[PDB]
Write a protein that binds this ligand. Structure first.
Ligand SMILES: O=C([O-])[C@@H](O)[C@H](O)CO
Ligand SMILES: O=C([O-])[C@@H](O)[C@H](O)CO
Ligand SMILES: O=C([O-])[C@@H](O)[C@H](O)CO
Ligand SMILES: O=C([O-])[C@@H](O)[C@H](O)CO
Ligand SMILES: [Mn+2]
Ligand SMILES: [Mn+2]
Ligand SMILES: [Mn+2]
Ligand SMILES: [Mn+2]
Lengths: 385, 385, 385, 385
């Protein structure tokens, strides 16, 4: 289960770079140089890295330090063959963003948020990114009077429309991916789920520029079925990117390595990405636990990839099993894929077999046979066929 | 705090009619006649009632019993002045619906679900309903292999498009309202939140026929901020109807009377409906606890209305208070309502005050003053100004 | 992975017997005869069954019907070799129990609850049960004023002390096991977790007669770590019995078959029961989903046992792996098992290496190596070593 | 609603002192001097303050800096009349504690944790504290193999027994209060609830030295009823201290000011503390949101006290209302307080009215009248009688 660059595994700088500061504790690990992380991830078999502006260029850098940091970065990419498929903006760490970036009550802050974003879109384009992620982690409230949400959605729409105007005017080939989260660090965050982000996108001036970047642990913080929300994003044509990690139910965001947390959900996710043929990056947004030293960091990054590859194998074996294919027909998955009424509405209304003469007790009596199908899935996951 | 019919308070037949059967216990109360409920609710000050088909007409009724049940109903409405603003279909109780109605794997079931729905749209129109609710409580799964969600959304879209075709062909003035729920009675339900239903509506052939019917307790079962999700529905123009009740956090749907559960959320909800000028029904989808006799039923129904009226008064007092209006300006709610960049994109990019010369430390230092604003809200709710 | 009676797998009558009535739907399956369930479970390899009084003897049975039902039951046990290790009382279904059994506000109800319980303890003893389970599913409240919890604990203590007096006066060899649940069907249930039940037991007159019966899905409805709570019960010497099932996070009790739900938790549970040498029944308190026909019932019951046996094998392989044993030492699990200060308090206080001369930066720098250990556990679970 | 020192309101140094660093953002406020906080809280009407060792004395302070910090502190207390009723140890911030203090896998760490604790017990005694709090926020795990919980409880018991030996040998008048939390910052924390801490205390060598310090938001992070868990602590005689704050359901610990979060729970809590006559400190463990400047800090601290006093008034009015007293009798709260069977076991068994002749249908038919009682409580809370 060895990754290669063709598996499209990517990692944020901030993930293996996390120093282990939590709301209750100091850093447990020294800061990593981005060029060290690029080299180490390349050796583990990753395909590329991603970044916040402030991960790569220290906040407040002069134009001469900026160019130096970028030059060193670019030399590490050249030396390793690593790519940069995605980039994003930090609109959450600096105190100026304490009430949000694009929906901060202070208008001057909202203008600054857009300027900081636009500067990094130029850099992302230069480094070859295809996807620009937006996680509005500070957009929201701890109290009901602090935020008018209708006004706040107006401001959010305004920001993303200006960003779409910018990209089209520059002729850039870059699309946006909005990342939902229900809470943390705000009491409640705006566009808290995949469904809310999809809905929002349909009100933008150019909807085709925008999709979603869902994260495993974010949807699970609302107790939601992550493979179901991804299915809906896939159905809408809007899965531009994805963030992979693990989460043990409804609590703070744990950012565990991928395959930890809800292991059956992880299985069904890989089953779906692979059978839909998702072709974007498999990006890990995770944190090596602060218990770990740098050896435990690279072990944790490597287990992300390993668990993806093991679950790919098991899901492929599942779908390829003739016994499973028979069980799928036993459960009428083939009938779910057929139109309900391709005959059309009038034929439906004239069909006595659909109502007047429908035997509802014989239909009610048919078993769905889902438990046998689910134990086949369990046997396949566990390698116990 | 006496309701009148002009407050637009409505109740489902199934709410005061709930016999108290739960997954662990038998009924504790005898079945109510719909005409008794109509009379009793009228005396309490309600404006109207709503129904599932099977609430009003016993499942399997002959065309002659059907007409009898409708005739008696209609006489009670005439005798009381009660209206019927909304109706809906039961696609969840009968065993035939054990795998869903519109997304049941069995195609014959899906055709039957549509026929049963269409029959009751005709009746709803006859009784004057303006809104037709669809809660797909059986659409979903307990296991990952049982349901392909992309196929299932295809089937769901197909069903609602056929219903839109029906209504337009009949020339009916009726709109649809999809009611989300995240789980229960299915392991996971399709379109689990307001955001997922809004998003889904944008893929229908005629989106303007469809809005949402959110329920307090449903969104709270995902730990979500109900007033935030309603704000988003209002922003999209899609709040066609609403279901009011109470819920104590993430557990089974409790259906407590409105104002129980999360009381501050209830306050902020009423604040928002009243200040947005929502004009639809204030419908209660609640269950008098099975501890109660018929006296406790009507006491519980009456407290729904009472708590709405008390919170309306307190929210109105809050917004009218000059001290609050000053606090709102202190917190820059006035600035949230102003465009970020009406000057447009090029002016933004040339504005040195937005970036080059923006003093981010002075901006970071400004307090938001949200805690003083939130304690004013608390003092107003509690009548402690 | 074939069970035999020596695996000590047991099932409630109510589990494979569940007709599929839920708060939103009618039964989907006909009632099973207890003697049919005994025969079917025997053929699948189970060791025994358990019962509520009202599962075996229809509520209101005459003394002559009672004896008939028991006689038929007893013939099926004799014909199959099945045992009855545990029994319990239904104090939740009948409407008289709507406010509880042992903590009902009505004193006459509380006396009736005890009489109904005592009658079934005699029967349990006759059928050979060693453990008497008490799940007070109706003990609790939907509202704060309805229940004084101090008085209610007085009443609960009183009930269990009278039951301990009864058993000792009869000379029975039977112990009690209290089953916690946090909510459902009450808004909140008294003794909501393992910890609350353990604590409560220490105030009874004869604490040694009482232990706990934890259920997987119950603790998970509070978002708690089930193997951690079982460890604590084992540490206290109070794991008298256990209920096995699956649960997908914080929602209604799903009662999924064992191994569904949280699969890694299931792994760590089996690891702990087997390495502590728990020797009681492995009892399944589950419900075949109402999607299923009788074939899906027996498939679901069989997957309970199968998943237990697969996880036993994987956990045994994990602990036996020399590479794992090395990793456990790398992570200092050996040091956790050593006394902190067997040298005693004064030696601790005089030890300059414990404070004055303790190098806290060198200690802070040591990695715990937990991620490598956790990926070994993952590889072992998935059969990917 | 003005507090005075006789209300026994206390605050941690770390609460108004929180600089606003969160897992995603830098500090938004400068560090406060402890002597400034003492002066400011005194002016607001507080009775005293509490501290971690490291709040008062910077970690690594020399014996000469230590004495200086203590001397200045003590002068502020003398100048204001503020007391120090409780103190505690920081065993969570420094990286050495990344795997715990008293249950760290490294034995040398566990010895250091005890030495650091003992040093601050001496200081607490000198400053007059009566209660010593222990929150083991780092005791737990992110993965199943990292922590044997039986060994870990052995180590936890060992630590608290050595601390009990120390206090008794010094002749100190100080008791311990264990503070539960279910998760955060560890994946799962040991003794996750009130019930688990109560149970644990019963295995210590001297149980009478130990009680609990529950926190509102901690129990609510498990979805539990906080007034119910406090009732159980009161029933056991173990409420030594309490931490007051607000929490909006199951997510990260929000630490909102008291009365925010679940307002009805806050009402029922104050009702219970006041009617049980709890006489310990009313301590606020809260964080002014990082949106706030120092003015919003003191406004937030003041609203803690204000909301307590308003809810005290409303709960007192509730219990004093003759209409409520009648409703309480209607709901049979008077009967809950009477023994079930003071007549004893044999009389119970011979009582034909308890079983043979018990009319279970007439008993089942009685309403509990809880909804009318709960609306009286609602009217009283809202000042709408
Ligand atoms: O999820 C988060 O928390 C971030 O890493 C987000 O993906 C990018 O800002
Ligand atoms: O919410 C539910 O559970 C139903 O009352 C729905 O509003 C209509 O079918
Ligand atoms: O858990 C439940 O819900 C019951 O089966 C309990 O174990 C026995 O009454
Ligand atoms: O609750 C926490 O998080 C701490 O303030 C605890 O009360 C004392 O260490
Ligand atoms: Mn992310
Ligand atoms: Mn509803
Ligand atoms: Mn159980
Ligand atoms: Mn605390």
């Amino acid at each position: 289960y060895q990754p290669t660059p063709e598996d499209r595994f990517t990692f944020g700088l901030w993930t293996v770079g996390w120093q282990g500061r939590d709301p209750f504790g100091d850093a447990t690990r020294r800061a990593l140089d981005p060029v060290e992380s690029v080299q180490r991830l390349a050796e583990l078999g990753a395909h590329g890295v991603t970044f916040h502006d402030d991960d790569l260029i220290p906040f407040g850098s002069s134009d001469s330090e900026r160019e130096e940091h970028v030059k060193r970065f670019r030399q590490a990419l050249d030396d390793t063959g690593m790519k940069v498929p995605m980039a994003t903006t930090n609109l959450f760490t600096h105190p100026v963003f304490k009430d949000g970036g694009f929906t901060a009550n202070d208008r001057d802050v909202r203008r600054y948020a857009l300027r900081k974003t636009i500067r990094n879109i130029d850099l992302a384009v230069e480094l070859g990114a295809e996807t620009y992620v937006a996680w509005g982690g500070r957009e929201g409230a701890e109290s009901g009077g602090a935020k008018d949400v209708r006004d706040a959605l107006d401001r959010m729409k305004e920001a993303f429309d200006l960003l779409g105007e910018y990209v089209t005017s520059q002729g850039y080939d870059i699309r946006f991916a909005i990342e939902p989260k229900p809470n943390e660090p705000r009491g409640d965050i705006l566009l808290p789920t995949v469904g809310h982000a999809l809905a929002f996108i349909e009100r933008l001036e150019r909807p085709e520029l925008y999709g979603v970047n869902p994260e495993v642990g974010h949807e699970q913080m609302a107790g939601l079925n992550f493979p179901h929300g991804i299915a809906q994003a896939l159905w809408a044509g809007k899965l531009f990117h994805i963030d992979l990690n693990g989460q043990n139910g409804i609590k703070y965001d744990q950012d565990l390595r991928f395959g930890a947390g809800d292991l059956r959900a992880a299985f069904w996710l890989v089953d779906l990405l692979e059978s839909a043929g998702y072709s974007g990056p498999r990006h890990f947004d995770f944190k090596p636990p602060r218990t770990e030293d740098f050896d435990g960091v690279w072990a944790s990054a490597a287990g992300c990839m390993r668990n993806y590859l093991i679950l790919k194998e098991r899901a492929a074996a599942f779908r390829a099993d003739p016994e499973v294919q028979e069980a799928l027909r036993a459960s009428r998955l083939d009938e779910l894929a057929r139109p309900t009424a391709a005959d059309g509405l009038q034929a439906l209304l004239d069909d006595r077999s659909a109502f007047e003469e429908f035997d509802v007790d014989a239909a009610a009596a048919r078993g769905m046979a889902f438990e046998r199908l689910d134990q086949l899935a369990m046997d396949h996951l566990l390698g116990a066929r």
